């Protein structure tokens, strides 16, 4: 239950950003295609509850690791926005900053 686990509040954030195999798998899970959503549901359940409109009261580190993951995933394959449309869409407040960066860099959703 919450606990402290390794370092600050992070769910093996490493394995999720270690390679597209996991970053994509999770991103694919966000689409609830099958045998993926439920699996990553833990990370999505803990994320939506923490990151973004979920735990504004939380410390702050989470916000850092997140953005870092947003900047990394953004360039990794800007699949983020894709997951955003599938989840965290109604939010449209925090990710806005996460997207603003993609504007300064150029890396934007591969919308055809």
> What is the separation of C-alpha 19 from the centre of its chain, rounded to a whole number of angstroms?
14
Residue 30 CB burial class (10 angstroms; 0-12, 13-18, ≥19) = buried
Instruction: Give the determination technique.
Output: NMR
Q: How many domains does the chain have?
A: 1
**Distance of alpha carbon 45 from alpha carbon 40, whole angstroms:** 8
- Compute the Cα dihedral for 35, 36, 37, 41 and give only its sign: positive
Q: Are the CB atoms for 88 and 47 separated by under 8 Å?
A: no
The residue whose two tokens read 């983020």 is: 80
What's the CATH number where 109 sits?
Answer: 1.10.2080.10
> 34-42 long-range CB contacts below 8 Å, 24 or more apart?
42/11
Range of the structural domain that residue 34 is part of: 1-112
Q: Are the CB atoms for 50 and 62 separated by under 8 Å?
A: yes
For 10, 82, 93, 112, the CA distances from 108, given in Å and listed in that order, are: 26, 10, 17, 11
């Amino acid at each position: 239950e919450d606990k402290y686990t390794d370092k600050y509040d992070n769910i093996n954030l490493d394995e999720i950003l270690a390679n597209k195999r996991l970053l994509v798998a999770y991103v694919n899970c966000v689409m609830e295609r099958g045998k993926c959503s439920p699996e990553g549901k833990e990370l999505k359940e803990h994320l939506q509850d923490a990151i973004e409109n979920g735990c504004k009261k939380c410390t702050e580190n989470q916000e850092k690791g997140a953005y870092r993951v947003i900047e990394h995933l953004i360039k990794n394959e800007i699949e983020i926005w894709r997951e955003l449309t599938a989840k965290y869409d109604p939010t449209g407040n925090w990710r806005k900053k996460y997207e603003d960066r993609a504007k300064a860099a150029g890396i934007v959703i591969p919308e055809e």
